[PDB]
Amino acid sequence: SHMQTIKCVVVGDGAVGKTCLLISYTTNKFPSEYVPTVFDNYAVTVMIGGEPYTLGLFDTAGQEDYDRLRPLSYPQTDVFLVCFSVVSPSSFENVKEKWVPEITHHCPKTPFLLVGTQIDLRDDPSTIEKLAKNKQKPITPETAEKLARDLKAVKYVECSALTQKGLKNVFDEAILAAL
Amino acid sequence: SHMQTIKCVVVGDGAVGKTCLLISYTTNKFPSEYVPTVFDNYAVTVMIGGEPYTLGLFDTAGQEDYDRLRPLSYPQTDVFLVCFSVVSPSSFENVKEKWVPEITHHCPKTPFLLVGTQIDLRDDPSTIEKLAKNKQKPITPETAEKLARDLKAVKYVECSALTQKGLKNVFDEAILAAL
Amino acid sequence: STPELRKTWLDSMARIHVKNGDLSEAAMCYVHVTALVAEYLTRKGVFRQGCTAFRVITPNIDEEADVHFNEDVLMELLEQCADGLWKAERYELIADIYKLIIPIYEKRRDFERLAHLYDTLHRAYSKVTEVMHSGRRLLGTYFRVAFFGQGFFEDEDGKEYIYKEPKLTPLSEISQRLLKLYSDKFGSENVKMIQDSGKVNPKDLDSKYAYIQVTHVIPFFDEKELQERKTEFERSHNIRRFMFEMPFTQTGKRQGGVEEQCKRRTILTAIHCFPYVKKRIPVMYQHHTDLNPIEVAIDEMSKKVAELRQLCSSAEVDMIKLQLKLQGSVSVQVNAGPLAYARAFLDDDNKVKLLKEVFRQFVEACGQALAVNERLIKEDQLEYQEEMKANYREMAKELSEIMHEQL
Amino acid sequence: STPELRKTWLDSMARIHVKNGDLSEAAMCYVHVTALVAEYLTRKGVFRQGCTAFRVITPNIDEEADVHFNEDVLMELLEQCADGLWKAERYELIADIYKLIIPIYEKRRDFERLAHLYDTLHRAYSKVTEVMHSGRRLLGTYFRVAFFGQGFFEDEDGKEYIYKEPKLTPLSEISQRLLKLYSDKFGSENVKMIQDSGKVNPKDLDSKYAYIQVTHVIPFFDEKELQERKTEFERSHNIRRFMFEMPFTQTGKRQGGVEEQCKRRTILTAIHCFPYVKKRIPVMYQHHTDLNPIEVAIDEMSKKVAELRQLCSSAEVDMIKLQLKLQGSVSVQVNAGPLAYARAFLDDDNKVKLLKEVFRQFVEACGQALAVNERLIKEDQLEYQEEMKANYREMAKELSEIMHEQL
């Protein structure tokens, strides 16, 4: 009867665009066009296998100032989204070093996906140059899929809030994983 | 679905009032009030255990001129009504001597009832006198019930077409016996 | 407070009808109460029509021309009429009630109530096709009843009614019931049944007695009405006129030979239509029409050809009933036989012509009946069937000897 | 033969809508054909109303103002509209169609057809209460779409439409679909997406490119309309106006801090209502209204109190969704927090008053949300719940420091 409300907690470093993509998707607005909110967290209704689902996206701060409080929101979680930007090697690193350790400490059996962000920046000349001067290149899907299977993530998905590419699919998969 | 049409064949001596009571009952007319018909046989719809039933009453001639043809109408019969007048000792006799022999010859397993007629004549002074001068009295129910159980009739029923007493019941029982 | 008082009486009547199992009379009581509340509320501007909106359900509604009364009350009364008419098995009339409430439920967005009434309507129309096929709906039988005996009946003396009886109540049942009822309250020796269906001249009654006349009637319709009322239900609802046929002869009367047999058809008009809030209704007006012996003959022959036709025209034929009717036309044992009409009237007033016509269809009809029966019989007949065929041939031969024609 | 020709076009449109799964547009096509046949037949005196009888179903019917056309044909078309509207999941509109045929079936005594339509109506109203409870009916999402580039779009250049998309089609889906569609037919390097939701000045577009602007909109209703349209369905059917909200700042523009943040609400009017016989409809007229940063603040706060209230007022509460909203009001991690509004505007234009009011209900609402959550939590939270309680207390204290009040 009444529609069911999936709990999805979103974690990752603080400048990988994670909140931006949560707001863009749930408001159906391009990243530059939404009215800023002083509130946290987002709800969106999505259709999967012909059926509607309310997706509750719980946003978290990726900063250390919040290591204590953040895990409080972890009980009752149906699925985790672990975000890093594909043009930020430190982001990717923190998936391995901080993020999946943290969520699997607290929720050993709750599924999670690896979410690659800002994929439209793989094409940005300036971004590629900045990475080059440190002998780095943007993360590829291949290398992200690997980390996903090695870490035991249900799968890897990636998107650009900017171009909207892959955005819908990311949350389609999050719901599929919770079910 | 479609309502079911019970076959009831009516036999007995020719001056016991049998046709009269068939016509009276099926037309809902007192014996003196119905329009005479040159046709034979009658259909009437009756309600039993809350359900309607079409009762087909096949009339026969009680005379010997008809011994040959009469039994032709006996195949497919669901129930027999064997009629005698309760103020006519010969009638009663013919039940034993001619009528049940005939119907059970042809339909050994089809039920029949004994029907006593003209019961309002048990009270007629003139009729009782006529019977008295031959050392006879009108047949009583007791004596009719006996013949009924001895002959293997399902039961004995009796009526007056004149007063309408017992008339409905006679055909209620005929349908109950066919079922 | 007359409206309130009328409702009180109607509600009280309905309860009694319910205990007695007269559920159509209860239902009319609900309709009359609902009509009076609707009349009131339409005048207040609260509802868009009163009384006349219910005239399609019953013409008797004309008789009905607080904050105890409001929209909510009207709604509950409408719902009650719908269930009342369901229980009375008058399914065809439920939509007339529900059309009046549907817009109210729509306006209130009451979708669960809409769902409920549509479910009832669906079931109602399903029952309609069902009983139209099975004949298992028995809406009642009717009788003229009249009482006589000033000393006994006081004001009821000479008054004629039409009584609407339950189901298939036969003459033997109502006549014995009323005989009992009054035998009990006057003494069996002071109560007489008048069987004669003709007008009773009081001047030849014995003041010493209470008399009761009971006569079976059926609903009567003229040609125009038969065309407007196209179903059995439409010929069983809102009926005001009733008819019976009585034998007479000129030498007075009743039952005679075919050559002398007349028939009087009496049409009686009740002051209200059935069904009504009561199960017995005063006779208002009556009249009659007499037929000749040749007219009677024509009348009976026709009803026989139509009968055999209907039986044959059926999707699925009812064999027994076909046999009953066929045998009784061609293999007559007890009564005079169809030929007696031919001898008496067709042996060499020129509506003799018409009796000839009818006899033409009759031979063909019996013919068709034989053909049909041939395909239904299961051998164990066959002889039976053979005889009737032989009887039919013989009969055709004679009608030619008489009409000097084929056949 | 224009009527015949219009029918041919509408029938052809419907087939395409059916293959595409746009069953509301197919259904409107059936309704328009039925309306045109009804118009024709009413003029011939064969049917009692044309076009306008269907206006309740769709105001667009006005656009439609042989012995190929007759009563039988109208009847079959009515039946088709009913099934069409069933398949489009617009259950509430089926009775409007069936009211038009019911009297015809009654007149013809077609009781099996009556039974069938009432069964449909019953199921329709059952689905209505069902989906009103479960939210599983998804009638579609809407977008403003506008194309730019004379060289590419010819006549389509500058034209704005509202597009009605299936189910819950999100911006990411339609925008990528249209980008593909035109990238394919012009070359990916000649096609640009305009993300800016503001009016695009053509004078600053590059003639070398085809541009596409897509912006999500929702149905718009004024106060009077919100009162007439009392259900979600009534706010999803026959809708002509759409709205979106766009951020701006005076120094131009879009996204700024709370102190500088404006919002423009744009109302767009389509030339026809949805649903229609096409799934995209030209914009006819538009206008907008700007809000102040304090007005924006007031706006967002209210939508939050209403939100928390709705969540608490529920028969059965949805705990997760309650937690999502509650946590995001009192335990804010990422964004500025509700207090930022209080600091920026309530620290010692007198509609400052109203922002104070709203903040009063907000603290109470969060309060109620906490109470409710306390009874739903299964211990494994409790700490979580404790923190939010602690956060809520802290927050109340500060708003007093600012409003100099209780709370």
Swiss-Prot record, chains A, B:
Give the modified residues of type Phosphotyrosine: 66
Q: What is the effect of changing residue 19 to N?
A: Constitutively inactive. Does not interact with PARD6 proteins. Inhibits filopodia formation. No effect on NR3C2 transcriptional activity
What GO CC annotations are associated with the protein? apical part of cell; cell-cell junction; centrosome; cytoplasm; cytoplasmic ribonucleoprotein granule; cytosol; dendrite; endoplasmic reticulum membrane
Listed Pfam families: Ras
Instruction: Please give the catalytic activity noted in the UniProt record.
Output: GTP + H2O = GDP + phosphate + H(+)
Q: Which GO terms describe its molecular function?
A: apolipoprotein A-I receptor binding; G protein activity; GBD domain binding; GTP binding; GTP-dependent protein binding; GTPase activity; identical protein binding; protein kinase binding
The family note in this entry says: Belongs to the small GTPase superfamily. Rho family. CDC42 subfamily.
Name of the protein this chain belongs to? Cell division control protein 42 homolog
- Organism encoding this protein: Homo sapiens
Curated annotation (Swiss-Prot), chains C, D:
Known tissue expression: Widely expressed, with highest expression in heart and placenta. Expressed at intermediate level in kidney, brain, lung and skeletal muscle.
The superkingdom of the source organism is Eukaryota
Taking every annotated instance into account, which residue ranges of this chain make up the domain DOCKER?
Answer: 1-406
Where found?
A: Endomembrane system
From the UniProt record, list the coiled-coil ranges.
294-328, 373-406
Q: Where is this region: Interaction with CDC42?
A: 62-406
Question: What more does the entry say?
Answer: 'Zizim' means 'spike' in Hebrew.
Q: What does this protein do?
A: Guanine nucleotide-exchange factor (GEF) that activates CDC42 by exchanging bound GDP for free GTP. Overexpression induces filopodia formation.
Oligomeric form and interacting partners: Homodimer. Interacts preferentially with nucleotide-depleted CDC42.
Query: So what family is this one in?
Result: Belongs to the DOCK family.
Domain writeup: The DOCKER domain is necessary and sufficient for the GEF activity.
Q: What is this protein called?
A: Dedicator of cytokinesis protein 9
Task: Name the source organism.
Answer: Homo sapiens
